[PDB]
Amino acid sequence: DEYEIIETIGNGAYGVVSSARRRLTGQQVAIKKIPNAFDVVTNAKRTLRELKILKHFKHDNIIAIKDILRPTVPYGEFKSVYVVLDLMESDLHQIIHSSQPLTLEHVRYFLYQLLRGLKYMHSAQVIHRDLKPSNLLVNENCELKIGDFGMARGLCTSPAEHQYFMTEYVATRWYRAPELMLSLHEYTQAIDLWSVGCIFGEMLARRQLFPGKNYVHQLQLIMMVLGTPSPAVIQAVGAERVRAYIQSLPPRQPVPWETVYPGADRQALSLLGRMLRFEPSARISAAAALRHPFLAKYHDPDDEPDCAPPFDFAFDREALTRERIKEAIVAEIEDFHARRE
Ligand SMILES: C[C@H](NC(=O)n1nc(N)nc1Nc1ccc(Cl)cc1)c1ccccc1
Protein backbone atom coordinates (compact mmCIF):
# COMPACT_ATOMS: atom_id res chain seq x y z
CA ASP A 1 0.00 0.00 0.00
CA GLU A 2 0.85 3.77 -0.24
CA TYR A 3 0.13 4.72 3.44
CA GLU A 4 0.51 3.19 6.92
CA ILE A 5 -1.97 4.16 9.70
CA ILE A 6 -0.43 5.26 13.06
CA GLU A 7 -3.47 6.28 15.23
CA THR A 8 -6.89 7.97 15.34
CA ILE A 9 -6.34 11.62 16.34
CA GLY A 10 -8.54 14.59 17.20
CA ASN A 11 -8.57 17.67 14.96
CA GLY A 12 -10.05 21.12 15.68
CA ALA A 13 -11.12 21.80 12.05
CA TYR A 14 -12.29 18.31 10.84
CA GLY A 15 -13.01 16.24 14.02
CA VAL A 16 -11.70 12.65 13.94
CA VAL A 17 -8.75 11.92 11.47
CA SER A 18 -6.01 9.25 11.26
CA SER A 19 -2.31 10.15 11.67
CA ALA A 20 -0.42 8.26 8.97
CA ARG A 21 2.83 8.06 7.01
CA ARG A 22 3.70 7.56 3.32
CA ARG A 23 5.39 4.09 3.10
CA LEU A 24 8.12 5.08 0.55
CA THR A 25 9.24 8.40 2.17
CA GLY A 26 8.22 8.10 5.85
CA GLN A 27 6.47 11.54 5.49
CA GLN A 28 3.83 12.08 8.17
CA VAL A 29 0.30 12.99 6.99
CA ALA A 30 -3.28 13.22 8.31
CA ILE A 31 -5.89 11.05 6.54
CA LYS A 32 -9.49 12.21 6.76
CA LYS A 33 -12.27 9.73 5.89
CA ILE A 34 -15.61 11.23 4.71
CA PRO A 35 -17.88 8.17 5.13
CA ASN A 36 -21.09 7.91 3.07
CA ALA A 37 -20.00 11.22 1.40
CA PHE A 38 -22.79 11.12 -1.25
CA ASP A 39 -25.80 10.15 0.97
CA VAL A 40 -27.10 13.67 1.85
CA VAL A 41 -27.20 16.70 -0.54
CA THR A 42 -25.96 19.25 2.10
CA ASN A 43 -22.97 17.06 3.14
CA ALA A 44 -22.07 16.20 -0.48
CA LYS A 45 -22.17 19.94 -1.55
CA ARG A 46 -19.89 20.77 1.44
CA THR A 47 -17.33 18.09 0.45
CA LEU A 48 -17.31 19.53 -3.17
CA ARG A 49 -16.91 23.16 -1.91
CA GLU A 50 -14.05 22.19 0.42
CA LEU A 51 -12.16 20.15 -2.26
CA LYS A 52 -12.44 23.03 -4.80
CA ILE A 53 -11.41 25.73 -2.28
CA LEU A 54 -8.38 23.75 -0.94
CA LYS A 55 -7.26 22.83 -4.50
CA HIS A 56 -7.46 26.55 -5.50
CA PHE A 57 -5.28 27.76 -2.58
CA LYS A 58 -1.51 27.21 -2.32
CA HIS A 59 -0.42 29.07 0.84
CA ASP A 60 1.55 28.02 3.95
CA ASN A 61 -1.14 29.42 6.28
CA ILE A 62 -4.02 27.48 4.66
CA ILE A 63 -4.56 23.71 5.01
CA ALA A 64 -3.43 21.84 1.84
CA ILE A 65 -4.68 18.65 0.15
CA LYS A 66 -1.49 16.53 -0.07
CA ASP A 67 -3.31 13.70 -1.96
CA ILE A 68 -6.84 12.31 -2.53
CA LEU A 69 -7.31 8.53 -2.70
CA ARG A 70 -8.71 7.30 -6.04
CA PRO A 71 -11.73 4.88 -6.10
CA THR A 72 -10.16 1.38 -5.86
CA VAL A 73 -13.65 -0.23 -6.34
CA PRO A 74 -16.52 0.15 -9.02
CA TYR A 75 -18.01 3.71 -9.37
CA GLY A 76 -21.38 2.63 -7.90
CA GLU A 77 -19.54 1.15 -4.89
CA PHE A 78 -17.46 4.37 -4.21
CA LYS A 79 -19.14 5.72 -1.05
CA SER A 80 -16.33 7.11 1.14
CA VAL A 81 -13.69 9.72 0.36
CA TYR A 82 -10.15 9.75 1.84
CA VAL A 83 -8.24 13.05 1.79
CA VAL A 84 -4.51 13.23 2.69
CA LEU A 85 -3.77 16.51 4.53
CA ASP A 86 -0.96 18.31 6.41
CA LEU A 87 -0.56 16.63 9.81
CA MET A 88 -1.40 19.27 12.49
CA GLU A 89 -0.95 18.10 16.07
CA SER A 90 -2.84 20.97 17.75
CA ASP A 91 -4.97 24.13 17.22
CA LEU A 92 -5.21 27.62 18.73
CA HIS A 93 -8.12 26.55 21.06
CA GLN A 94 -5.97 23.83 22.71
CA ILE A 95 -2.96 26.22 23.01
CA ILE A 96 -4.92 29.23 24.45
CA HIS A 97 -6.88 27.03 26.93
CA SER A 98 -3.99 24.97 28.34
CA SER A 99 -0.94 25.28 30.63
CA GLN A 100 1.32 25.97 27.59
CA PRO A 101 3.02 29.40 27.40
CA LEU A 102 1.21 32.18 25.53
CA THR A 103 3.24 35.38 25.77
CA LEU A 104 2.60 38.61 23.79
CA GLU A 105 5.15 37.25 21.25
CA HIS A 106 3.06 34.05 20.77
CA VAL A 107 -0.03 36.31 20.25
CA ARG A 108 1.89 38.54 17.73
CA TYR A 109 3.21 35.50 15.80
CA PHE A 110 -0.12 33.58 15.67
CA LEU A 111 -2.02 36.78 14.67
CA TYR A 112 0.52 37.45 11.91
CA GLN A 113 0.12 33.97 10.31
CA LEU A 114 -3.67 34.12 10.57
CA LEU A 115 -3.76 37.60 8.83
CA ARG A 116 -1.19 36.41 6.22
CA GLY A 117 -3.49 33.53 5.21
CA LEU A 118 -6.56 35.80 5.29
CA LYS A 119 -4.97 38.42 3.03
CA TYR A 120 -4.42 35.71 0.39
CA MET A 121 -7.91 34.10 0.89
CA HIS A 122 -9.70 37.55 0.84
CA SER A 123 -8.00 38.59 -2.44
CA ALA A 124 -9.52 35.37 -3.95
CA GLN A 125 -13.00 36.72 -2.91
CA VAL A 126 -13.44 33.93 -0.35
CA ILE A 127 -14.98 34.69 3.07
CA HIS A 128 -14.35 31.89 5.57
CA ARG A 129 -17.33 32.97 7.76
CA ASP A 130 -16.37 30.51 10.59
CA LEU A 131 -13.00 31.60 12.02
CA LYS A 132 -12.49 30.43 15.62
CA PRO A 133 -9.37 29.17 17.54
CA SER A 134 -10.39 25.49 17.00
CA ASN A 135 -10.20 25.62 13.22
CA LEU A 136 -6.78 27.39 13.25
CA LEU A 137 -4.51 24.39 13.18
CA VAL A 138 -1.02 24.52 14.73
CA ASN A 139 1.74 21.99 14.11
CA GLU A 140 4.95 21.19 16.06
CA ASN A 141 6.96 23.84 14.11
CA CYS A 142 4.46 26.56 15.25
CA GLU A 143 2.93 26.84 11.75
CA LEU A 144 -0.67 28.06 11.83
CA LYS A 145 -3.03 26.92 9.05
CA ILE A 146 -6.63 27.97 8.52
CA GLY A 147 -8.92 24.96 8.06
CA ASP A 148 -12.65 24.06 7.88
CA PHE A 149 -14.03 25.86 4.81
CA GLY A 150 -17.57 24.40 4.98
CA MET A 151 -19.12 27.80 5.82
CA ALA A 152 -17.01 29.67 3.16
CA ARG A 153 -18.82 31.78 0.57
CA GLY A 154 -18.05 34.47 -2.02
CA LEU A 155 -19.45 38.00 -2.24
CA CYS A 156 -22.56 36.46 -4.05
CA THR A 157 -24.85 33.66 -2.63
CA SER A 158 -27.88 31.69 -4.02
CA PRO A 159 -31.36 32.58 -2.60
CA ALA A 160 -32.06 28.76 -2.67
CA GLU A 161 -29.94 28.25 0.54
CA HIS A 162 -31.55 28.84 3.99
CA GLN A 163 -28.54 30.86 5.38
CA TYR A 164 -29.12 33.56 2.64
CA PHE A 165 -32.15 34.67 4.74
CA MET A 166 -31.11 33.36 8.18
CA THR A 167 -27.71 35.00 8.62
CA GLU A 168 -27.85 34.75 12.47
CA TYR A 169 -27.33 30.95 12.05
CA VAL A 170 -24.15 31.40 10.00
CA ALA A 171 -21.19 29.98 11.92
CA THR A 172 -20.35 30.07 15.68
CA ARG A 173 -22.27 32.45 18.01
CA TRP A 174 -19.19 33.59 19.99
CA TYR A 175 -17.35 34.74 16.78
CA ARG A 176 -20.35 35.77 14.63
CA ALA A 177 -20.09 39.32 13.17
CA PRO A 178 -22.86 41.87 13.99
CA GLU A 179 -23.88 42.01 10.24
CA LEU A 180 -24.72 38.26 10.53
CA MET A 181 -26.48 38.53 13.94
CA LEU A 182 -28.57 41.52 12.76
CA SER A 183 -28.92 40.77 8.98
CA LEU A 184 -27.32 44.19 8.06
CA HIS A 185 -27.31 43.34 4.25
CA GLU A 186 -23.52 44.03 4.01
CA TYR A 187 -21.66 40.64 3.86
CA THR A 188 -17.99 40.94 2.89
CA GLN A 189 -14.49 39.76 4.01
CA ALA A 190 -15.08 42.18 6.95
CA ILE A 191 -17.14 39.23 8.51
CA ASP A 192 -13.74 37.49 9.03
CA LEU A 193 -12.10 40.54 10.61
CA TRP A 194 -14.73 40.60 13.43
CA SER A 195 -13.88 36.89 14.09
CA VAL A 196 -10.10 37.77 14.03
CA GLY A 197 -10.74 40.49 16.68
CA CYS A 198 -12.59 37.94 18.89
CA ILE A 199 -9.66 35.45 18.43
CA PHE A 200 -7.06 38.30 19.07
CA GLY A 201 -8.90 39.24 22.30
CA GLU A 202 -9.13 35.56 23.36
CA MET A 203 -5.29 35.09 23.00
CA LEU A 204 -4.64 38.27 25.07
CA ALA A 205 -6.73 37.21 28.10
CA ARG A 206 -6.77 33.38 27.42
CA ARG A 207 -10.64 33.57 27.67
CA GLN A 208 -13.54 34.17 25.22
CA LEU A 209 -14.41 37.83 24.70
CA PHE A 210 -18.17 37.53 23.98
CA PRO A 211 -19.30 34.10 25.37
CA GLY A 212 -23.06 34.64 24.79
CA LYS A 213 -25.57 32.13 26.21
CA ASN A 214 -28.15 32.72 23.41
CA TYR A 215 -29.07 35.27 20.68
CA VAL A 216 -30.08 38.25 22.86
CA HIS A 217 -27.37 37.60 25.51
CA GLN A 218 -24.77 37.56 22.65
CA LEU A 219 -25.87 41.12 21.56
CA GLN A 220 -25.95 42.27 25.20
CA LEU A 221 -22.30 41.15 25.68
CA ILE A 222 -21.18 42.90 22.47
CA MET A 223 -23.07 46.08 23.53
CA MET A 224 -21.49 45.96 27.06
CA VAL A 225 -18.08 46.74 25.47
CA LEU A 226 -18.90 48.38 22.08
CA GLY A 227 -21.76 50.48 23.46
CA THR A 228 -25.16 51.05 21.82
CA PRO A 229 -25.00 50.69 17.97
CA SER A 230 -25.48 53.93 15.92
CA PRO A 231 -28.95 54.96 14.55
CA ALA A 232 -27.83 53.98 10.98
CA VAL A 233 -26.96 50.40 12.04
CA ILE A 234 -30.29 50.13 14.05
CA GLN A 235 -32.33 51.13 10.91
CA ALA A 236 -30.37 48.43 8.91
CA VAL A 237 -31.53 45.71 11.43
CA GLY A 238 -33.85 43.45 9.35
CA ALA A 239 -36.05 42.04 12.13
CA GLU A 240 -38.50 44.37 13.95
CA ARG A 241 -38.30 42.51 17.34
CA VAL A 242 -34.47 42.78 17.53
CA ARG A 243 -34.66 46.41 16.31
CA ALA A 244 -37.24 47.25 19.03
CA TYR A 245 -35.20 45.39 21.67
CA ILE A 246 -32.04 47.43 20.77
CA GLN A 247 -34.09 50.75 20.75
CA SER A 248 -35.72 49.87 24.15
CA LEU A 249 -32.26 49.72 25.80
CA PRO A 250 -30.73 52.80 27.58
CA PRO A 251 -27.86 54.48 25.59
CA ARG A 252 -24.35 53.13 26.22
CA GLN A 253 -20.87 54.45 25.45
CA PRO A 254 -17.97 52.21 24.21
CA VAL A 255 -15.73 50.85 26.99
CA PRO A 256 -12.04 51.49 26.06
CA TRP A 257 -10.02 48.33 25.34
CA GLU A 258 -7.55 49.52 28.08
CA THR A 259 -10.47 48.77 30.55
CA VAL A 260 -11.47 45.41 28.91
CA TYR A 261 -7.80 44.17 28.99
CA PRO A 262 -6.00 46.15 31.80
CA GLY A 263 -2.30 46.75 31.17
CA ALA A 264 -2.31 44.96 27.75
CA ASP A 265 0.12 45.98 24.94
CA ARG A 266 -0.79 49.43 23.47
CA GLN A 267 -0.12 48.49 19.82
CA ALA A 268 -2.12 45.23 20.33
CA LEU A 269 -5.14 47.15 21.73
CA SER A 270 -4.83 49.75 18.89
CA LEU A 271 -5.12 47.00 16.19
CA LEU A 272 -7.84 45.19 18.22
CA GLY A 273 -9.97 48.42 18.22
CA ARG A 274 -9.69 48.60 14.36
CA MET A 275 -11.15 45.06 14.04
CA LEU A 276 -14.07 45.10 16.53
CA ARG A 277 -16.49 47.63 15.01
CA PHE A 278 -20.28 47.21 14.52
CA GLU A 279 -19.95 48.73 10.97
CA PRO A 280 -18.38 46.21 8.54
CA SER A 281 -16.91 49.01 6.33
CA ALA A 282 -15.24 50.66 9.40
CA ARG A 283 -13.14 47.53 10.20
CA ILE A 284 -9.47 47.29 9.12
CA SER A 285 -8.83 44.74 6.25
CA ALA A 286 -6.43 41.73 6.60
CA ALA A 287 -3.99 43.50 4.19
CA ALA A 288 -3.98 46.77 6.19
CA ALA A 289 -3.77 44.90 9.56
CA LEU A 290 -0.52 43.34 8.29
CA ARG A 291 0.75 46.99 7.84
CA HIS A 292 -0.11 47.86 11.55
CA PRO A 293 2.85 48.67 13.92
CA PHE A 294 1.86 45.59 16.07
CA LEU A 295 2.99 43.13 13.30
CA ALA A 296 6.01 45.15 11.95
CA LYS A 297 8.42 42.47 13.44
CA TYR A 298 7.14 39.88 10.92
CA HIS A 299 5.60 42.00 8.20
CA ASP A 300 7.27 41.65 4.78
CA PRO A 301 5.01 42.63 1.79
CA ASP A 302 7.20 40.59 -0.62
CA ASP A 303 6.43 37.44 1.50
CA GLU A 304 2.65 38.06 1.90
CA PRO A 305 1.03 37.15 -1.44
CA ASP A 306 -2.41 37.64 -2.91
CA CYS A 307 -4.31 34.82 -4.71
CA ALA A 308 -4.87 35.20 -8.47
CA PRO A 309 -7.27 34.35 -10.13
CA PRO A 310 -10.27 34.80 -7.74
CA PHE A 311 -12.32 31.75 -6.67
CA ASP A 312 -15.77 31.23 -8.24
CA PHE A 313 -18.70 29.85 -6.21
CA ALA A 314 -20.99 29.35 -9.25
CA PHE A 315 -20.76 25.50 -9.05
CA ASP A 316 -22.21 25.72 -5.49
CA ARG A 317 -25.27 27.82 -6.46
CA GLU A 318 -26.29 25.03 -8.96
CA ALA A 319 -29.16 22.78 -7.78
CA LEU A 320 -27.52 19.35 -8.17
CA THR A 321 -28.76 15.93 -7.11
CA ARG A 322 -26.63 13.69 -4.84
CA GLU A 323 -25.58 11.67 -7.97
CA ARG A 324 -24.47 14.83 -9.88
CA ILE A 325 -22.46 15.97 -6.80
CA LYS A 326 -20.78 12.54 -6.59
CA GLU A 327 -19.91 12.99 -10.33
CA ALA A 328 -18.39 16.45 -9.63
CA ILE A 329 -16.42 15.13 -6.54
CA VAL A 330 -15.09 12.19 -8.64
CA ALA A 331 -14.13 14.74 -11.41
CA GLU A 332 -12.25 16.82 -8.72
CA ILE A 333 -10.27 13.71 -7.63
CA GLU A 334 -9.39 12.91 -11.30
CA ASP A 335 -8.38 16.59 -12.00
CA PHE A 336 -6.18 16.59 -8.85
CA HIS A 337 -4.22 13.50 -10.13
CA ALA A 338 -4.16 14.74 -13.76
CA ARG A 339 -2.63 18.12 -12.68
CA ARG A 340 0.17 16.29 -10.76
CA GLU A 341 0.93 13.88 -13.68
C1 LIG B 1 -16.74 18.53 10.96
C2 LIG B 1 -16.51 17.15 10.35
N1 LIG B 1 -16.97 17.16 8.96
C3 LIG B 1 -16.07 17.05 7.91
O1 LIG B 1 -14.82 17.00 8.04
N2 LIG B 1 -16.62 17.05 6.55
N3 LIG B 1 -18.00 16.88 6.28
C4 LIG B 1 -18.07 16.99 4.90
N4 LIG B 1 -19.18 16.97 4.20
N5 LIG B 1 -16.80 17.22 4.27
C5 LIG B 1 -15.92 17.24 5.32
N6 LIG B 1 -14.55 17.42 5.31
C6 LIG B 1 -13.66 17.62 4.24
C7 LIG B 1 -14.04 17.68 2.88
C8 LIG B 1 -13.05 17.91 1.93
C9 LIG B 1 -11.74 18.09 2.37
CL1 LIG B 1 -10.57 18.38 1.21
C10 LIG B 1 -11.32 18.05 3.70
C11 LIG B 1 -12.30 17.80 4.65
C12 LIG B 1 -17.20 16.08 11.18
C13 LIG B 1 -16.40 15.19 11.94
C14 LIG B 1 -17.02 14.22 12.75
C15 LIG B 1 -18.44 14.14 12.79
C16 LIG B 1 -19.24 15.01 12.02
C17 LIG B 1 -18.62 15.99 11.21
Residue numbers in the entry: 53 to 393
What do the authors say?
Compounds 4–6 are close analogues of one another. Compounds 4, 5 and 6 bind at a different binding site to compounds 1, 2 and 3. This site lies adjacent to the ATP-binding site. As observed for the complex of compound 1 with ERK5, compounds 2–5 bind to a ‘DFG-in’ conformation of ERK5 in which both the hydrophobic R-spine (residues Leu106, Ile117, His180 and Phe201 in ERK5) and C-spine (Val69, Ala82, Leu144, Leu188, Leu189, Val190, Ile251 and Met255) are intact. Compared with the structures of ERK5 in complex with the hinge-binding compounds 1–3, however, the P-loop is pushed away from the αC helix towards the ATP-binding site upon allosteric inhibitor binding (compare the grey and coral P-loops). Differential flexibility in the P-loop amongst kinases has been implicated in the selectivity of certain conventional ATP-binding site-targeted kinase inhibitors, and may have implications for the selectivity of our allosteric ERK5 inhibitors (see §3.5). In contrast to the P-loop, the αC helix orientation is unchanged upon the binding of compounds 4–6. The side chain of Lys84 is displaced by binding of compounds 4–6 and reorients to form a hydrogen bond to the backbone carbonyl of Val68 from the P-loop.
The ERK5 protein, which is encoded by the MAPK7 gene, comprises an N-terminal kinase domain and a large C-terminal domain containing transcriptional transactivating functionality and nuclear localization and export sequences (NLS/NES). ERK5 is the effector kinase of a canonical kinase module comprising MEK (MAPK/ERK kinase) 5, MEKK (MEK kinase) 2/3 and ERK5 itself.
